[PDB]
Homo-oligomer: A and B are copies of this chain.
């Protein structure tokens, strides 16, 4: 069979609004299957004509107990907003949903092919199954709660058509989880991560931004892809080793593939003229977490994997499994080392020195150790921690020193209650020497009964105080090399 507009949505959708999906189902269900949405594209994209000899794509959509209205809406958005000749097929992978009808019913729809899993396989395995079944030259992956925008597909396909090693993404617009409003996202963003290997959005550097001012809708190199939503050459996908097949249910997906692509001679792009709405939510409907992440880290990251473990030590304990093929795969492909990746692809990622004992932020509750924008001979303080690590960026060195940039925490005066000072690091300065104590929860001034203390913060700044059971003496680095 049936044309999408002849499809009976009222009937299909017919069988606490946040309970089942962790988004507002009532609000979603009110919505027309082909509801209108704002054109969130740069003006320059609007004014643009496209090839036609573009390769068609096989759209792969994977799902597990998805809201019918949302699922349908994703599918119709694809159909309605994409030139038909470019849509070979839509492959629905039902990942062991309670109710098989959810997907089965959608099978009536033009170009829609539904694949059911007879047991829970997860997002990664499911995608592969779908990809495998795919007839087109080009693979497109989407989430099951997405909304495609105006001329979303062409700019994506254009790219991988020119160069098949390009792995490309649209700008992911925001669909509000509560009211289902379609909101235009920032185009000034790159993909990224911290050493805990948790995905995050980086802003572009002003340097970068400025250098684009010439062409603002140009592709954007990204060290990491969000993961849900991308476009990839089918053969290339297969060649590069599909997905890691032993990963399970929950995430880590974006992670592994992003490394692999870059390291093994490919590239990752965000494409601003390409706009796709996505329902972002706060929670899932925790160890696989660590598992999968581990599998990625162990295979790709080389020595730098340690920095991950440093950020997340509990993860050392989590068994991950057999990574033999994946290692062989890397060998076979003649992939670059992680060091290369960091240097060339993700240089803005702040990387500890190899000898550093500890690193990152110096946390005291929700508060962080902060330079207060002070420099040399300057006092030091606390500030609510913000993970933007700037004046909150610290290191515990092999020289036993607590350094920010080339500045060092300096015990100017041994008298308890005495304010410490920021001073140019000297290796031969004893006053600058610090040791971790009490299970890496405190900072003791080496050769003394003196402890780094925040009680004086409001009265002048961080002080040196006699070591004791006080909470103001509690300090924890975010990364520990222990």
Residues of A within 8 A of B (CB): 38-40, 43, 173-174, 176, 181, 183-189, 201, 203, 205-207, 209-210, 280, 347-348, 350, 373, 375-377, 386, 388, 405-407, 412, 421, 423-427, 429
Contacts and interface: CB of A to CB of B under 8 A. Distances in A.
Contacts of A412: 181
A406 B373 contact: no
Contact of A347 (B173, B210, B280, B350): B210
B203 A405 contact: yes
Interface of A is mostly: loop
A185 B376 CA distance: 5
Most chain B CB within 10 A, of A187, A210, A406, A424, is at A424
A206 B350 contact: yes
Contact of A186 (B207, B209, B424): B424
A183 B426 contact: no
A174 B407 CA distance: 13
Contacts of A347: 207, 210
A174 B376 contact: yes
B207 A376 contact: no
A183 B375 contact: no
B426 A174 contact: no
A424 B40 contact: yes
B426 A184 contact: yes
A424 B348 contact: no
Nearest to A211: B347
Nearest to A412: B181
Given A203-B405, A207-B205, A350-B206, A377 B424 contact: no
B375 A424 contact: no
Contacts of A207: 205, 207, 347
Given A188-B406, A206-B350, A406-B188, A183 B373 contact: no
A388 B373 contact: yes
Contact of A348 (B38, B39, B174, B206): B206
A429 B174 CA distance: 16
A23 to B, nearest CB: 13
B201 A375 contact: yes
A424 B189 contact: no
B38 A183 contact: no
A209 B351 CA distance: 13
Nearest to A347: B210
B423 A183 contact: yes
Contacts of A348: 206
A405 to B, nearest CB: 5
Contact of A406 (B186, B377, B426): B186
A362 B187 CA distance: 23
Most chain B CB within 10 A, of A184, A203, A407, is at A184
Contacts of A38: 426, 429
A470 to B, nearest CB: 26
B373 A184 contact: no
Contacts of A405: 186, 188, 203, 209
